Amino acid sequence: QVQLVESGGGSVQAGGSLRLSCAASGYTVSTYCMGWFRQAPGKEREGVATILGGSTYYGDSVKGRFTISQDNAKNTVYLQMNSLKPEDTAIYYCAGSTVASTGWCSRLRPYDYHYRGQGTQVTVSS
Question: For residue 44, what are the contacts with CB-CB under 8 A and spacing of at least 6?
Answer without folding.
Answer: none
